């Protein structure tokens, strides 16, 4: 289970999206190395120009590649679900704007980890920060707060993304997340804890298509009596 993540794992990502009736598709490819908590991914919009800012899709585009240090390994739901996989569902509510609803299945197909996503967005402002492409191409580091969901045999997560607005302040994106196993397990239900998540957005200087390169480092850390444990 964890055994499937000891080396470099190839990743494929597929997203079909519809935001305010603007329909689009994205294909992604890269690799994950959970030993170092490391992800390297490149995404191409296969339908032309992406109708939303690339940063707004980062969280939607594989937390099984997080580094769980020894004292945290009892709490790694994500790898425990593998290879059969899990369903990851989110509502992402953009402050004073629309919301995304996403449903993804994350699973192994042999040696390859596949993240396949459907996204529907509604209630966006055509001249707001999202459909109006007013967000900076960058990304703040954040903590992802995870809790068990015994009745669902899975987990929930809550966190807020701060997206820089061009010549402005921040666009908040409220994330509500639920993860449930696809198979019959067994799986690990964790104590409360968080993922410390660092993301870098890059461009491929030779790529003509609308695209995003993503480098991420993620490490799990504990929570004690409401206080985040620190490294």
């Amino acid at each position, epitope marked *: 289970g964890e055994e499937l993540f000891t080396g470099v794992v190839p990743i494929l990502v597929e997203l079909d999206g519809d935001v305010n009736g603007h329909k689009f598709s994205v294909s992604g490819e890269g690799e994950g190395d959970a030993t170092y908590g490391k992800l390297t991914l490149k995404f191409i919009c296969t339908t032309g120009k992406l109708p939303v800012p690339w940063p707004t899709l980062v969280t939607t585009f594989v937390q099984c590649f997080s580094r769980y240090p020894d004292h945290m390994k009892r709490h790694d739901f994500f790898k425990s679900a*593998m290879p*059969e996989g899990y369903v990851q569902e989110r509502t992402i509510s953009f402050k004073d704007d629309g919301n995304y609803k996403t449903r993804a*299945e994350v*699973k192994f197909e*042999g040696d390859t980890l*596949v993240n396949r996503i459907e996204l529907k967005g509604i209630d966006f402002k055509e001249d707001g920060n999202i459909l109006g492409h007013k967000l900076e191409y960058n990304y703040n580091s954040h903590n992802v707060y995870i809790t068990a969901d015994k009745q669902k045999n899975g987990i929930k997560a809550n966190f807020k993304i701060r997206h820089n607005i061009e010549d402005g302040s921040v666009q908040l994106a409220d994330h509500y997340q639920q993860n449930t196993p696809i198979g019959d397990g067994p799986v690990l239900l964790p104590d409360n804890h968080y993922l410390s998540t660092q993301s870098k957005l890059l461009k491929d200087p030779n790529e003509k298509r609308d695209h995003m390169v993503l480098l991420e480092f993620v490490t799990a850390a504990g929570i004690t009596h409401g206080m985040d444990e620190l490294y």
Partner: nanobody
Amino acid sequence: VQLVESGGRLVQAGDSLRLSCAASGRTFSTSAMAWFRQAPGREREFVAAITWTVGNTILGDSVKGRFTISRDRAKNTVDLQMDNLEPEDTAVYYCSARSRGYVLSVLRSVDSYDYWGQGTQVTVS
């Protein structure tokens, strides 16, 4: 998900035959599809499997070099191309689908699938 196999007929030894299976319903989750067969009098036998996203294939020992599996993700079909057919290929051919992720080795087991078709009869004279 509903699986519907087609293409079975009576053919002569040495002929070719292509089977096809159509998956209907909420197919978003498909992770692999496979063909099995059961000749009356004998036990069910793995024939071929294909991984859904990349299309990696695996074959049963009895059909290597003669049978080819392929799939079309847009059409949600999986085909079995059978060349150099032999009387011992006479069987009902069943289509199966999995949604759970997997390591490749489990795809050869009849118990590794989430969905099963009705079968199509192939007879080889």
